[PDB]
């Protein structure tokens, strides 16, 4: 699974003393985060599960 | 990036924030996911 966003952390000193980490800017490969699954592997294992069922 | 594949999903929100100097406030901004925020009642 991947989140292709080289984003920054514009931390803001909303004290007193204590600090808050806000979201800076979002740059890079602006794509939606997603997961990669080996399809044949899933199909194969799922089948093995169905056998039990 | 036009037109719109990302659907935004984040808003360029700004607000008068209380700082270390409890007194004079500071207009700041931050990017939030629309899953975190909700419209009350730019907006």
């Amino acid at each position, epitope marked *: 699974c991947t989140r*292709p966003n*080289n984003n920054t952390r514009k931390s803001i000193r909303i004290g007193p003393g204590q600090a808050f980490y806000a979201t800076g*800017d979002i*740059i*890079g*490969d*602006i*794509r*939606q985060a997603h997961c990669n699954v080996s399809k044949a592997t899933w199909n194969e294992t799922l089948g093995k599960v169905v056998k039990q069922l | *990036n*036009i*037109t719109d*594949d990302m659907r935004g999903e984040l808003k360029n929100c700004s607000f008068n924030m209380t700082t270390e100097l409890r007194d004079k406030k500071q207009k700041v901004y931050s990017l939030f996911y629309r899953l975190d925020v909700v419209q009350i009642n730019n907006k």
Partner: single-chain antibody, 236 residues
């Protein structure tokens, strides 16, 4: 908006070397791969290679690999290109160009096209060839439809793109993936094709449309990028 600004021009004889720089603004510089491409006089565009500033990985045209060096100074938001032992193939306007945004249904390098281009810097030595376009010139009146054709010496990945260029200005991307319209491009424009032959269409012409149009084949690899001679759409 996103902008790429380059260095100044030079004249060379074969055997000499040249270094050109490219400063980017408007986006996170490290986020996108930068291509180096050139366009010789009386000749079409040529791809030197690309560097990914994030990883530092690079790809060089086989033609280029020994002679060229691409560097990137991320603090500077600058990309550099240096080429020694100039030869004919060497002289042209040299352009840097950023790759496009990642696509939802894209295979690797599908976004390898040149999304945003610098104005280009001129260097002149000796001479180079590929894709073929027709007609050389297309005279039309605002309102008519324009059709442009591109014949390739090789078949393609469906990684075919068209660019619009008013001379003296940076080239601009019209269509990508043979038929996907670039953001900000009007419905008027459409593209299609397969194999060796591809075409671009403008349903109804507008005055803004007059410019030169070029086709390009792009991929992951060194030899993979190739461009056509260009077709001029002139008003009349």
């Amino acid at each position: 908006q996103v902008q790429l600004v380059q260095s100044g021009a030079e004249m060379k004889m074969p055997g000499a070397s040249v270094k050109v720089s490219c400063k980017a603004s408007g986006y996170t510089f490290t986020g996108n791969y930068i291509h180096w491409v050139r366009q010789a006089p009386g000749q079409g565009l040529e791809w030197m290679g690309w560097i990914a500033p994030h990883s530092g990985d690079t790809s060089y045209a086989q033609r280029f690999q020994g002679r060229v060096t691409m560097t990137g100074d991320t603090s500077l938001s600058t990309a550099y290109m240096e080429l020694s032992r100039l030869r004919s193939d060497d002289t042209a306007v040299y352009y840097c160009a950023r790759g496009p945004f990642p696509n939802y249904y894209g295979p690797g390098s599908y976004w390898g096209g040149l999304d945003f281009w610098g104005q280009g810097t001129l260097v002149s030595v000796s001479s180079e060839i590929v894709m073929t376009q027709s007609p050389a010139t297309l005279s039309v009146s605002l309102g008519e439809r324009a059709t442009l054709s591109c014949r390739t010496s090789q078949n393609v990945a469906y990684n075919f793109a068209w660019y619009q260029q008013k001379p003296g200005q940076a080239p601009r991307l019209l269509i990508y993936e043979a038929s996907s319209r670039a953001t900000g491009t009007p419905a008027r424009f459409s593209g299609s094709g397969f194999g060796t032959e591809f075409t671009l269409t403008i349903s109804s012409m507008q005055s803004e449309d007059f410019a030169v149009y070029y086709c390009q084949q792009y991929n992951n690899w060194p030899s993979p990028f190739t461009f056509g001679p260009g077709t001029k759409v002139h008003i009349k």
